[PDB]
Curated annotation (Swiss-Prot), chain A:
Name recorded for this polypeptide: Spike protein S1
Role description: Attaches the virion to the cell membrane by interacting with host receptor, initiating the infection. The major receptor is host ACE2. When S2/S2' has been cleaved, binding to the receptor triggers direct fusion at the cell membrane. When S2/S2' has not been cleaved, binding to the receptor results in internalization of the virus by endocytosis using host TFRC and GRM2 and leading to fusion of the virion membrane with the host endosomal membrane. Alternatively, may use NRP1/NRP2 and integrin as entry receptors.
Organism: Severe acute respiratory syndrome coronavirus 2 (2019-nCoV)
Region of interest: Disordered: 23-39
Glycosylation (residues): T27, S29, N35, N47
Subunit structure: Binds to host ACE2. RBD also interacts with the N-linked glycan on 'Asn-90' of ACE2. Cleavage of S generates a polybasic C-terminal sequence on S1 that binds to host Neuropilin-1 (NRP1) and Neuropilin-2 (NRP2) receptors. Interacts with host integrin alpha-5/beta-1 (ITGA5:ITGB1) and with ACE2 in complex with integrin alpha-5/beta-1 (ITGA5:ITGB1). May interact via cytoplasmic c-terminus with M protein. May interact (via N-terminus) with host bilirubin and biliverdin, thereby preventing antibody binding to the SARS-CoV-2 spike NTD via an allosteric mechanism.
Source organism phylogeny: Viruses, Riboviria, Orthornavirae, Pisuviricota, Pisoniviricetes
Superkingdom classification of source: Viruses
Amino acid sequence: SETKCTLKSFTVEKGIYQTSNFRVQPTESIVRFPNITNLCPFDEVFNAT
Amino acid sequence: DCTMYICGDSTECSNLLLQYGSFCTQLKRALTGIAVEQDKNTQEVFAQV
Ligand SMILES: *[C@@H]1O[C@H](CO)[C@@H](O[C@@H]2O[C@H](CO)[C@@H](O)[C@H](O)[C@H]2NC(C)=O)[C@H](O)[C@H]1NC(C)=O
């Protein structure tokens, strides 16, 4: 039925008829990053005496 | 693969690409014509026995 909708006909003669396309799908988001360091002292301004 | 060449993975793109009409159908039809003739070229040169 996908072939008949590609050809826009109801009779499909013999032969290979390139229907759709395919492609496995990703399944994650692994967003690696550089182990942070210089992590500011926001406390200086938020915890002054 | 017209969709994978232009857009590439993205899916928000696919709805935008549909707005240009049948350009991707024309590319597949044109290239299939070449693909079928290249095997016939070989049969006509060698398959004469
Ligand atoms: C705000 O500052 C106070 C002190 O200026 C912090 O309290 C210290 O917390 C550490 C964490 O275990 C203790 O070892 C100290 O004995 C505490 N000192 C005092 C005087 O209480 C507090 O943790 C700071 N809070 C934030 C959110 O920065």
